[PDB]
Amino acid sequence: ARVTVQDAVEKIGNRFDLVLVAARRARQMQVGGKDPLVPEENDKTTVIALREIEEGLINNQILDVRERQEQQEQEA
Amino acid sequence: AVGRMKFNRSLLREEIEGSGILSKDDIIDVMKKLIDIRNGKGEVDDIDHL
Amino acid sequence: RSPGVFFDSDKGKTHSSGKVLYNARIIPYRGSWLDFEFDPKDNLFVRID
Amino acid sequence: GQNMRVAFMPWNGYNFEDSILVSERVVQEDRFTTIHIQELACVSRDTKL
Amino acid sequence: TEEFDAIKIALASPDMIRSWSFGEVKKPETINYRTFKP
Amino acid sequence: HARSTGSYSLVTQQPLGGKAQFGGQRFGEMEVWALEAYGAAYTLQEMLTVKSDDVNGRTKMYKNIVDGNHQMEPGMPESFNVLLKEIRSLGINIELEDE
Amino acid sequence: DIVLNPLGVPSRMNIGQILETHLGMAAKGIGDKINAMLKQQQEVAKLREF
Amino acid sequence: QSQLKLLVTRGKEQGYLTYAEVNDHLPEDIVDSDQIEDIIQMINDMGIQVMEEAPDADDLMLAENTADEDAAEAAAQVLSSVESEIGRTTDPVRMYMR
Amino acid sequence: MGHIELASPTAHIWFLKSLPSRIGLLLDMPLRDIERVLYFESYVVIEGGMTNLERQQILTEEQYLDALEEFGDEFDAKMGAEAIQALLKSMDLEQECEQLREELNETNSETKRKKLTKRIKLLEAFVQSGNKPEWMILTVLPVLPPDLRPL
Amino acid sequence: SSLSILAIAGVEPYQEKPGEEYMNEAQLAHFRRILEAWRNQLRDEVDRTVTHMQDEAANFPDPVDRAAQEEEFSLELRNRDRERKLIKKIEKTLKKVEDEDFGYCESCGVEIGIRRLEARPTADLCIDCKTLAEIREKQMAG
Amino acid sequence: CAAYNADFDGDQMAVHVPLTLEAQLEARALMMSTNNILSPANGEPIIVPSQDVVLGLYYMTRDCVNAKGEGMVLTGPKEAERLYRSGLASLHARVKVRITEYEKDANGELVAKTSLKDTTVGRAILWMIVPKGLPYSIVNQALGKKAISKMLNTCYRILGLKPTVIFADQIMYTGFAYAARSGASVGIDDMVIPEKKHEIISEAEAEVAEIQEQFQSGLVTAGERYNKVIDIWAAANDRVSKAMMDNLQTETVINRDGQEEKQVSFNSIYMMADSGARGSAAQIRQLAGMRGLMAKPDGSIIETPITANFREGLNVLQYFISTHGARKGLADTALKTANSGYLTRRLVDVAQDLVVTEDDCGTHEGIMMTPVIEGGDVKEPLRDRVLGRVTAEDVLKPGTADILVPRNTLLHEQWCDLLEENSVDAVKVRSVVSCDTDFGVCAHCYGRDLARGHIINKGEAIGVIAAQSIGEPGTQLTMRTFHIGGAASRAAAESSIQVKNKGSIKLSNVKSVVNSSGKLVITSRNTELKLIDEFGRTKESYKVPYGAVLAKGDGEQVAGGETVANWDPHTMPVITEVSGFVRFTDMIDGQTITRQTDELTGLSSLVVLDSAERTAGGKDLRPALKIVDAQGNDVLIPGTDMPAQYFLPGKAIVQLEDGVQISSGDTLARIPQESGGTKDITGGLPRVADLFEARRPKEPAILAEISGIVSFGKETKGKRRLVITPVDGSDPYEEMIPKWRQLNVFEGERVERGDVISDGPEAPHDILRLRGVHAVTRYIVNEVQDVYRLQGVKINDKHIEVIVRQMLRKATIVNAGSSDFLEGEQVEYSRVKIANRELEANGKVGATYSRDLLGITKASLATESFISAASFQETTRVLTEAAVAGKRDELRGLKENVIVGRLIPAGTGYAYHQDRMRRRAAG
Ligand SMILES: C[C@H](CCC(=O)NCCC[N+](C)(C)C[C@H](O)CS(=O)(=O)O)[C@H]1CC[C@H]2[C@@H]3[C@H](O)C[C@@H]4C[C@H](O)CC[C@]4(C)[C@H]3C[C@H](O)[C@]12C
Numbered sequence A: 001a002r003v004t005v006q007d008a009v010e011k012i013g014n015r016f017d018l019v020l021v022a023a024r025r026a027r028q029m030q031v032g033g034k035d036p037l038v039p040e041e042n043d044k045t046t047v048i049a050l051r052e053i054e055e056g057l058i059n060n061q062i063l064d065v066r067e068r069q070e071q072q073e074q075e076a
Numbered sequence B: 001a002v003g004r005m006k007f008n009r010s011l012l013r014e015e016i017e018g019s020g021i022l023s024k025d026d027i028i029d030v031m032k033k034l035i036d037i038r039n040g041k042g043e044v045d046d047i048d049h050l
Numbered sequence C: 001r002s003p004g005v006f007f008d009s010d011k012g013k014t015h016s017s018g019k020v021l022y023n024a025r026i027i028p029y030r031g032s033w034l035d036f037e038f039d040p041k042d043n044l045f046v047r048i049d
Numbered sequence D: 001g002q003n004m005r006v007a008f009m010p011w012n013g014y015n016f017e018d019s020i021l022v023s024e025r026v027v028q029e030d031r032f033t034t035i036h037i038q039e040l041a042c043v044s045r046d047t048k049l
Numbered sequence E: 001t002e003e004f005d006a007i008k009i010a011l012a013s014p015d016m017i018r019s020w021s022f023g024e025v026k027k028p029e030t031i032n033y034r035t036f037k038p
Numbered sequence F: 001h002a003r004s005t006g007s008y009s010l011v012t013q014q015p016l017g018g019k020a021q022f023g024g025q026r027f028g029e030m031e032v033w034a035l036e037a038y039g040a041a042y043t044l045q046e047m048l049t050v051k052s053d054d055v056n057g058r059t060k061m062y063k064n065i066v067d068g069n070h071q072m073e074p075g076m077p078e079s080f081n082v083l084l085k086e087i088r089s090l091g092i093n094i095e096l097e098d099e
Numbered sequence G: 001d002i003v004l005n006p007l008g009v010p011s012r013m014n015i016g017q018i019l020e021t022h023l024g025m026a027a028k029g030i031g032d033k034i035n036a037m038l039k040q041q042q043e044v045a046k047l048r049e050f
Numbered sequence H: 001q002s003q004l005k006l007l008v009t010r011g012k013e014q015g016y017l018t019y020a021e022v023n024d025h026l027p028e029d030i031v032d033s034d035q036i037e038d039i040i041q042m043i044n045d046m047g048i049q050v051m052e053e054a055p056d057a058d059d060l061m062l063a064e065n066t067a068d069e070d071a072a073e074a075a076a077q078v079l080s081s082v083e084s085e086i087g088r089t090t091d092p093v094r095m096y097m098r
Numbered sequence I: 001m002g003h004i005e006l007a008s009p010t011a012h013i014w015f016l017k018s019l020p021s022r023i024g025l026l027l028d029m030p031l032r033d034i035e036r037v038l039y040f041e042s043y044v045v046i047e048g049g050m051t052n053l054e055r056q057q058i059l060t061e062e063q064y065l066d067a068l069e070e071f072g073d074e075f076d077a078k079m080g081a082e083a084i085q086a087l088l089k090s091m092d093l094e095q096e097c098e099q100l101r102e103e104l105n106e107t108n109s110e111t112k113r114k115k116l117t118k119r120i121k122l123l124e125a126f127v128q129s130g131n132k133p134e135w136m137i138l139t140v141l142p143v144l145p146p147d148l149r150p151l
Numbered sequence J: 001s002s003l004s005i006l007a008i009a010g011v012e013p014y015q016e017k018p019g020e021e022y023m024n025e026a027q028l029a030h031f032r033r034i035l036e037a038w039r040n041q042l043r044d045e046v047d048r049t050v051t052h053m054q055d056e057a058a059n060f061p062d063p064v065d066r067a068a069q070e071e072e073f074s075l076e077l078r079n080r081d082r083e084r085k086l087i088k089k090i091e092k093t094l095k096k097v098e099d100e101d102f103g104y105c106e107s108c109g110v111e112i113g114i115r116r117l118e119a120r121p122t123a124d125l126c127i128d129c130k131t132l133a134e135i136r137e138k139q140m141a142g
Numbered sequence K: 001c002a003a004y005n006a007d008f009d010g011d012q013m014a015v016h017v018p019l020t021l022e023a024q025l026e027a028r029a030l031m032m033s034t035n036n037i038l039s040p041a042n043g044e045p046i047i048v049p050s051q052d053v054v055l056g057l058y059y060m061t062r063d064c065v066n067a068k069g070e071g072m073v074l075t076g077p078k079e080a081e082r083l084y085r086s087g088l089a090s091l092h093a094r095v096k097v098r099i100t101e102y103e104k105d106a107n108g109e110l111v112a113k114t115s116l117k118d119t120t121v122g123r124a125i126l127w128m129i130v131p132k133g134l135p136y137s138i139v140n141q142a143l144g145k146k147a148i149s150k151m152l153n154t155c156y157r158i159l160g161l162k163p164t165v166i167f168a169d170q171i172m173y174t175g176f177a178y179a180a181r182s183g184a185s186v187g188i189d190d191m192v193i194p195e196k197k198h199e200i201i202s203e204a205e206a207e208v209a210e211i212q213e214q215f216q217s218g219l220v221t222a223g224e225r226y227n228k229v230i231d232i233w234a235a236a237n238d239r240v241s242k243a244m245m246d247n248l249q250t251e252t253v254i255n256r257d258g259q260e261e262k263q264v265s266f267n268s269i270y271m272m273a274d275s276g277a278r279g280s281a282a283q284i285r286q287l288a289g290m291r292g293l294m295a296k297p298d299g300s301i302i303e304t305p306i307t308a309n310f311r312e313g314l315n316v317l318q319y320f321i322s323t324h325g326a327r328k329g330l331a332d333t334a335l336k337t338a339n340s341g342y343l344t345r346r347l348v349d350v351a352q353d354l355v356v357t358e359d360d361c362g363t364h365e366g367i368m369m370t371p372v373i374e375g376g377d378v379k380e381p382l383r384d385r386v387l388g389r390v391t392a393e394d395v396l397k398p399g400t401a402d403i404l405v406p407r408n409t410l411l412h413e414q415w416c417d418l419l420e421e422n423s424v425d426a427v428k429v430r431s432v433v434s435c436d437t438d439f440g441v442c443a444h445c446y447g448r449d450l451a452r453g454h455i456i457n458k459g460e461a462i463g464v465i466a467a468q469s470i471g472e473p474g475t476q477l478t479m480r481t482f483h484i485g486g487a488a489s490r491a492a493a494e495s496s497i498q499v500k501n502k503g504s505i506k507l508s509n510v511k512s513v514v515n516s517s518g519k520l521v522i523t524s525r526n527t528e529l530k531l532i533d534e535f536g537r538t539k540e541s542y543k544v545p546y547g548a549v550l551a552k553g554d555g556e557q558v559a560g561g562e563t564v565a566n567w568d569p570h571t572m573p574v575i576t577e578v579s580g581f582v583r584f585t586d587m588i589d590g591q592t593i594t595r596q597t598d599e600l601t602g603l604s605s606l607v608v609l610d611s612a613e614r615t616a617g618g619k620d621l622r623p624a625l626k627i628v629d630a631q632g633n634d635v636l637i638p639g640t641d642m643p644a645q646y647f648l649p650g651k652a653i654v655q656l657e658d659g660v661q662i663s664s665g666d667t668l669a670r671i672p673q674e675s676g677g678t679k680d681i682t683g684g685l686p687r688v689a690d691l692f693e694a695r696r697p698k699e700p701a702i703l704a705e706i707s708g709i710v711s712f713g714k715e716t717k718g719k720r721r722l723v724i725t726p727v728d729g730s731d732p733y734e735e736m737i738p739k740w741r742q743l744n745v746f747e748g749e750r751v752e753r754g755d756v757i758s759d760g761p762e763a764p765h766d767i768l769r770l771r772g773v774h775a776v777t778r779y780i781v782n783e784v785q786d787v788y789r790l791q792g793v794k795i796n797d798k799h800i801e802v803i804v805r806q807m808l809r810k811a812t813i814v815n816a817g818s819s820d821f822l823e824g825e826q827v828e829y830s831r832v833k834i835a836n837r838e839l840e841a842n843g844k845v846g847a848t849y850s851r852d853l854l855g856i857t858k859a860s861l862a863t864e865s866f867i868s869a870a871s872f873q874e875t876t877r878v879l880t881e882a883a884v885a886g887k888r889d890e891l892r893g894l895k896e897n898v899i900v901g902r903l904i905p906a907g908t909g910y911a912y913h914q915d916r917m918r919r920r921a922a923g
């Protein structure tokens, strides 16, 4: 999705907190705590996070739930 | 000498070279020409003429 | 501008009722200036430079 | 300068705007190659060290 | 580095001016001109 | 002309402009407004501080780039610190308050 | 050698360059014709006449 | 009535005030080299800054007229000062000289 | 930063020459008067007791001379920025504000009433901000760090 | 010739009859027609002009052709301003004709020639008063 | 390049590198080239083909009388292209082709319709590219600059971004390719001197000779000669231009099989003109025609023209004059741009801080948007004005209780299409100005219109967006102020009305009084006359003055071009409501009137002299026209007790003297008033700045403050008094007025508040004070927008609206209760304290406020935080005041945060600051 992020804004309509969510995810991807959920095409993590947003797998709520999941798992 | 030449040419006198300092008859002619243009028998000069 | 005698008008602006007020300025190469100018009331005023 | 053979026509938008298209033939003949003589200066001062 | 907000402006009192300053500059000289130490 | 990193000025710790010295273009007020027209706050923020006047921020960001991390640490622009010092040089107390 | 954009002529009211192109093409045509008559080395007379 | 009450009006009634005016309208005293500086700066908080010989164009003189504030003590200041003819000898040279 | 101990209290230019001269309006003293005071041409009576002179009255050279000769003691007057600072320190903001409120309760004239109100607001704002007027006159002068005025 | 002010209308030069009084119904109708035609043409020309200005205006990337495209417009607008100034003069002349006070000099009661009115139908003064006023004008102006 | 205003003649560009990951994302999402194709000013695309492309496509689509393969039938576009590339057919030749277009008929389904269309080869080859959703019609035509732009626009509206982008790229590539294949150039002989140039020139010269001969005769002073010559030259110039263009356009007299025909010529220069790639008629004029008259320095037009063309050669004099004109223009250009910069900067200073803070304020107020139906037609239709605005309330069909648009809905294109299917005229739309939320605006009141398609997203900085949109244009606008005074589309005349279209006649704001013949003579000053069309809509609108006899009244159908009203302009009749004899009151001869009386038919020319012309005894005597009956007693106006005593103003020519039974509606006395009847058009750049600085205009028109019977006052002191006495409220409102003011209402009349009393221009301040907010905002919007459209620069009203909101930032309190009773205070603080009072038990009191309107400069000067004000105001002053005040700056704004180098509160950083707000005053 390195042409037009129009569909990601159609998923999240703020068009501003969209970029913030994508930044949190793409920094969680760069610092290799996690791995990309999409088959990489030798892309960098920017368009990877955008592609992950557009398919509905990640948003703010899914990010928070999975984050608290990993937190409570690592607590044990 | 240039200043005097321009002064005498402005008042339409045949004489080209004068004594540099302002002779007073000249001044009188000056007020005559000023009141002439004030009457309208002449054009005013433009600060831009070569 | 060359030294000598110049007759300026400075028209239009002069009181926004016309009153085209003329003035002759006598400028030497080096030295103080002479000015003969008008007024709305047609009075001839002298100014030292 | 120099006189070149020009043709007025649009050639696949490489002269889109006032830009100019030119043939390898001009560079090959070295007719628009300029010589520039630049000056450089190295000055050796004496510091207190 | 603090995370700040609200920048306040007021007349400086003489005791605050003394407060910021670390020392008094009594002589106008700048540098020793021979050895350029201050 | 291109410049990555180079020499800075004495009083205003901005990068020198020109050809003899590496250069270093200049983001003007109009460009600031342009970025403001977008919701582009982080690019403006970096351009204004980490890229020009913040010494600690700029060195830390250099190291971050070398390490392959992309984060930021804006700090206080040096021009603003100079401003405070110049106003405080007058009889005017300007303090950064806290809550 | 050079391909110049035509859309620059009519709105840029410099039409002299077009006449320049024509007359210059004509001059090179003359030059070519002389080159041809010299490469065959016709005769002094014929170059002289032309 | 004075020689400045007719000026201050013009200043904002005709937009500007040419140098010629502020020159001849002065009283007799404080002509000292550039004593005008203070009255020009006060007149500047009303909108004047006329050019060499009073040109004109330029519909822009009211932004700067608004950019010079209501608080017009100056008016009072100038009035008092130019209505007493106490020599405004600011330059310390003159006062020490006396 | 550094600082300099000034021997003679000096006035802060900004609070004098700025179009609204805040020392002047705080002290209700015209600008020309304060100017004449600082440059040492005339005195001002700082608390002139049970005498024939007010507290913000200017005295000329030989009027002050004839007065001192006549009134040797119980008579405090001075010259210069230190005089201005002294009279500034002694003025009671709060009590004078209360006087102004009593005037407002008693005074009925349109333009005078407005002016009164303006002064009242001014003093109120000043005493709310917590700045004491005497600070407008500088005693210690800070000096900018060297690196910002480099050599 | 289709270039004057009588040409604009389909009218031909008048011809004062032997014992014809000066201002009669027919002459007044004639001049009213002339002025109305003149006006309506000028207004339609202004409409053309404005449409042209509205169509052309664009943002040019070259500073030496923005001036080119804004140096013919300045002249056009000059002509339009002048004609706008003349539309008020035509309106006033239509008011004098409608009020039946047309054809005489405003300075002196003398009547203005018919041929002069067919020359410049907006004429307000006789040639003599016109000349004297023109002198006074140029003198108070220049 | 069009977006950058860039040209390839050595212009340079800078390239910056976004470093952080968030910056990379910010660049890719909001700033990416492909995301911003729509202009922020209007909704239309920016990236349209520029010049070479359009030439290529134009060449491709044009049709020709005769070529190769006339009347061939091709099975599809691919075969067309195969035919062209083999050289068996010309790129343009009229042909029958089978084409399958797709249609969005269902809920987003594509339905293939496949049939035979009559088109060109070229048009089919171009149709190859077109994406599925577009109707063929699009390409079937000439395909010029306009058409191509409309093509892109429709592509965007139907399919969406991704396809529009791909289709634009395709258009570029194909256009370049086929432009190269066309091989269009420009030769010296391509610009043809019209055959009849010298003819018109000789005619004009003979006419000037006649005018010189008629000058020497002494029928014209020098001025008439100069003006007349210049005018004859102008006419000769435009005619010569038109003759050249006529020669040029349609000169290809190409032959079909047998006899011949004539057609749209293929002259390369002409195609460059007509396609809209470069050149306009005027430049073609200057190449092939006479380059008209030129102006000397002083602005005066030199009598002798050039008459030469660049194809031919000019001489010394002509070139010299052209130098005058050229250099004057070139020198003016620089200054013009450098002052437009100032306008844009002082327009950004006022609005910078405005940001979308709330989602929905919940206001019911809004502005009534109509189709601006200026007289004859719809100068600008509704759909353009209302597209992308939220609705304030439900709009009802032409039949009550049939809601077709639920409360606040965003009106996109399809809603507008539906809105067109009905015939609703007026729609309340929520406006930014009336938005209720303090410290910003609400998403809904603003609406969608942006580079993207959707409703505004919370957080975006709308203030600087609007300032930028209003500042970028303003360079097309001619620098120096001009005047036109044309008003082309007038009312045909000033007397009679002429209905253009056959519709029902419907009156607004009137009370007629039937006369003896039975005509509805209107006695209302504010009367308008609209026209409803076949299907219930307002087609025509006319303005009928006081006293105008009517012919056909209300309801009856008027056929096309019927004169429905008639009146003499410079004549205000006084109209009687009841019948009987006119009785003379206070009309003494010598004291107040001058006896000019006629014979049998009863004419007079009585002049009611004012105090100056009135003798010493007739100072207070108001001469009147008594309405008496046959018996004597004052007959009262119907329903009211007032005996109509018409105080006849100066020069009231009373025709009907005492002794003429007046019918109910006969004119009492004709009063001639030569009021100026033309609306001089004004324009250019400085007028805009002047409109934005809200400068009270020249001799201003006056309004009425309260209602009630008006009256005169102290006679002839240098301003006659007008006393508005309220029927119910207290009487005592006296307003002095200069004598030169013309009055529209009679003394013994009951006016309403805020009707016009004198003619001329109204000062926006009065508009706000009397009429209120929506009226001033509408006035400003319309007045500026007229200037901007005069040059053809399109701007959406919302930006002007935000600015106007910034101008109304301040109010002044007249009541009491918690404030200082006179302080200019922002309307937000007053509105919050009013909310406090009204929610709390106590009123306090109060407090009633009135809005004030400030010009953008002062409004900018009214900033709260002192770091901004020091950033652009006299720093010393603001710093000194803030130092004495001990003022505390929370910074809260954009420019402050810029200066301190922290996150702007707009856009991507709004969340950050919103977070901090929750962290403050929290745990
Ligand atoms: C020498 C020359 C005058 C030549 C002249 O006067 N020829 C007169 C020739 C007259 N004749 C021979 C032709 C006969 C008459 O014309 C007969 S008739 O009346 O015309 O019938 C004058 C005219 C302009 C003068 C210079 C300027 O001021 C600037 C400057 C002023 C300084 O203070 C001194 C130096 C400068 C450089 C001057 C030098 C010198 O002073 C100049 C060149």
Ligand SMILES: Nc1nc2c(ncn2[C@@H]2O[C@H](COP(=O)(O)OP(=O)(O)O)[C@@H](OP(=O)(O)OP(=O)(O)O)[C@H]2O)c(=O)[nH]1
Pocket (backbone or CB within 6 Å): A001, A002, A003, A004, A041, K165, K166, K169, K170
């Ligand atoms: N502006 C423009 N774009 C074109 C054009 N032609 C193709 N594209 C699109 O650009 C994108 C580039 O894709 P590729 O570069 O070929 O695929 P790749 O990265 O794996 O090598 C494609 O969509 P995409 O990036 O995969 O879209 P998405 O799925 O990422 O949202 C393609 O559809 C064109 O002419 N103009």
Ligand SMILES: Nc1nc2c(ncn2[C@@H]2O[C@H](COP(=O)(O)OP(=O)(O)O)[C@@H](OP(=O)(O)OP(=O)(O)O)[C@H]2O)c(=O)[nH]1
Pocket (backbone or CB within 6 Å): J082, J083, J085, J086, J089, K223, K224, K227, K228, K231, K300
């Ligand atoms: N096209 C056209 N315009 C006319 C004609 N006659 C008069 N005008 C314009 O009407 C204006 C009014 O002219 P007047 O002041 O009445 O002088 P006038 O008696 O000689 O007509 C003039 O503006 P102005 O400022 O005096 O002109 P100028 O000084 O700029 O040259 C003039 O340009 C005409 O026949 N044709």
Ligand SMILES: [Mg+2]
Pocket (backbone or CB within 6 Å): J061, J062, K006, K007, K008, K009, K010, K011
């Ligand atoms: Mg360029």
Ligand SMILES: [Zn+2]
Pocket (backbone or CB within 6 Å): J105, J106, J107, J108, J109, J110, J125, J126, J127, J128, J129, J130
């Ligand atoms: Zn006469």
Ligand SMILES: [Zn+2]
Pocket (backbone or CB within 6 Å): K360, K361, K362, K363, K434, K435, K436, K437, K441, K442, K443, K444, K445, K446
């Ligand atoms: Zn809202």
